[model samples]
Target: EELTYRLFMVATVGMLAGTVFLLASSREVKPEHRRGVYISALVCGIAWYHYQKMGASWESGSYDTGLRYVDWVLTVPLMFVEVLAVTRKGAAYNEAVRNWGIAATVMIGAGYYGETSAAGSNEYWTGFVIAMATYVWLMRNLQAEGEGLKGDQAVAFENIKNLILVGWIIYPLGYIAPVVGDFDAIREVLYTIADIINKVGLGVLVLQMARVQSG
Candidate 1:
């Protein structure tokens, strides 16, 4: 219980810091590309408050641990929108955005199914595999988008892709934490760590890009 309490506090506090950092920096972004930063800051702000509720619910020994899924269902899709809004350039932009948004929804939906399903059941592993495939699809599509970028844009796009591909893998692994062991709190903690890095780090990338381009 103490560990869960500590984990939730850390996650909530971390997201709180992320929310402030991102919202404050959002103003400095150029208007043409400012929406993505606003989206990022808004997502972190939502996450900040939602994580507090999640922590509270979990710590209270309530059977409502599925609150995290609600958090993901909203934020994950928006993440794809953020990436497409920021990195996209050229004829395929709209097409890529459409596909990536769909893939993002599928990824989170499948992962949530796995997380809530009976342990080691067909439903669980099947959902996990689908989530993994959706992630791969997102990465591949984004990589193609990266190909159209030049110089610094390409470099920054690649960094974002790597962060999603490499860093985001932590979530699926955490979803299957039952297979590794029955440590529910640890699973949540792993997700919390991943969220901090992915969300905050992605915001950092956007902030830096805005500064460099606006100057």
Candidate 2:
């Protein structure tokens, strides 16, 4: 656990720096945006602690012993991230907010089942289905609201949707795979692929935002 403890220290230092940066970089982001970053940075710090604890427990053969609590902690905060991102772009009372929260709760619950219960494959599928259905509903709603656009804007929206939908389709397979006992390997592969796609998709989104900000 020494290594995990050390890593926790490092993560705390990093998040503190992130908080400072967010507070200092005032003009580029609204006060609410900066607050989100600060809050997310704190959540990230807590997540890192849980991450370290999970790793330590696994290596120390105490993995199935109280490890579920750490996993649960990580899951809840991650769910918060999804809700936070959507709300920041819009507002908490919006339909978009409800859509995202439902999706995230389903996904996170499925994730919990995936990690803890090798017998809960059906739950994973249910969550995946809900997420996909919600994505379709959200897309329709966005379009109907005249918020959706064409050309580069369309591509950008579709790309973000792709990032989330691909997660619903592909990542849940990895989640359910744990029931078959291949989850560790399957999750590794899926996570690597998803991470790459997310990075690229997010970069594109940032560019679009910058263009809009400049104009």
Candidate 3:
């Protein structure tokens, strides 16, 4: 349990460190890369929600259960924005990405609903990760090859994915933290730490996406 708690904190720190790199890179990136700042912002918002949900566990009286619903509520908009973000310019890429995103969206919505019918978050996360990963690959390829940024957003995009992945990586350990010691001592503390890392990492990423086109 102690080892798991330590590991979670370490991974969370790594995500924060990666974001600092992004905030630094943002200043040098060109303005054209900003086309999808809103998408990044939405992603950041989701990360923020994750942090809130985790933190609310202590104060909110029933966080562990209802967070799934809150997650799904925010998640739906998160699904649609993948389409809007890509389609803003009305390109053929939008058609392609949107089609794929739609399939992913259905999988996500179904998976989220299936959480009760199924067992654990694994089923939903498995489908969710695939969809998110595919979209990241598609979008990254577009930004790297098509947008002509010479892979500027590639690093930032990768970092955003890292932020999400890091959260998943930390979650199990955070759960374990309570097992090692008293539930109160390590649980909320590790959760608070992880939440800060995710939220801040995401904010930096959003600022990166926003500044991408600011010149």
Candidate 4:
């Protein structure tokens, strides 16, 4: 239990570190690419605040999943915005960004309903299914946007796309931790780990892509 609290604190610090790293490096990218890198920093900044609250809650005898959900509701769509931040501009990208926001919202909202309000019940499964369905749409939507890029841009696009595909799957596993016997501790650990990877990990990826474009 103590170690878990420690991990939660560490995750909070990690979010802070990611925010600094991305913000400081945002200018290193091409002017065109800096928005994405900066937005990535915003993603970390948002997480840092929420993680602090969550960490405080952790030591208070209850971890607040509600605050974590709030973090996701904000950051997840911004994560998609980071993609749009770097991608080419036009009506096409505009539409994609709008669709991504809506899809991201649906995914998180559905998961919240399933995980919190209806776990193990039929409504829970329905929520879970809707969450996954929206997630898939966001994934493929980005893939389609990524299809025509070349060189480092394409590589960067592929990397984050897989981050969504492979890295994000951990979330659902954590969501189902109750089925695996023990929801609180296990879910906390998994979510803390996932946030570090996806939040900080995405920041690192954006910074590198920015650096490459600076040259």
Best by TM-score: 4
Candidate 3 per-residue C-alpha lDDT over 1-215 given as tens digits, one digit per residue, 9 for 90 to 100: 44434444454454445445544554464554443443444544554455444444535444464453454345434533433342344575566555646654654455445443333346545644554554455445434432433365555555655565565345445433432555644554555465556555555564564454353
Clashes by residue pair, model 1: none
Whole-model Cα lDDT per candidate?
Answer: 0.76, 0.45, 0.48, 0.82
Once superposed on the true structure, which residue ranges of model 2 sit more than 4 Å away at CA? 1-27, 32-43, 64-95, 110-115, 118-147, 150-159, 167-170, 179-211
lDDT of 4: 0.82
Report the C-alpha lDDT of model 1 over 7-30, residue by residue, as the tens digit: 777878887787788788877777
lDDT at position 180, candidate 1: 78
Across 1-215, the per-residue lDDT of candidate 2 in tens digits comes to: 44443443454354444334433443465444343344434444454454456545546645443343443335433433432353345554354556545665554554454454335556556655665554466445444432445566455555445554454355556555666674564454444344333432333343343333334
Pick by lDDT: 2 or 3, better one: 3
Which ranges of candidate 3 are over 4 A from the true structure? 1-64, 76-88, 96-111, 117-151, 165-196
Tell me the RMSD of model 2 versus the true structure.
6.1
Q: What is the C-alpha RMSD of each candidate to the true structure, in Å?
A: 2.1, 6.1, 8.1, 1.6
| Number of the top lDDT candidate | 4
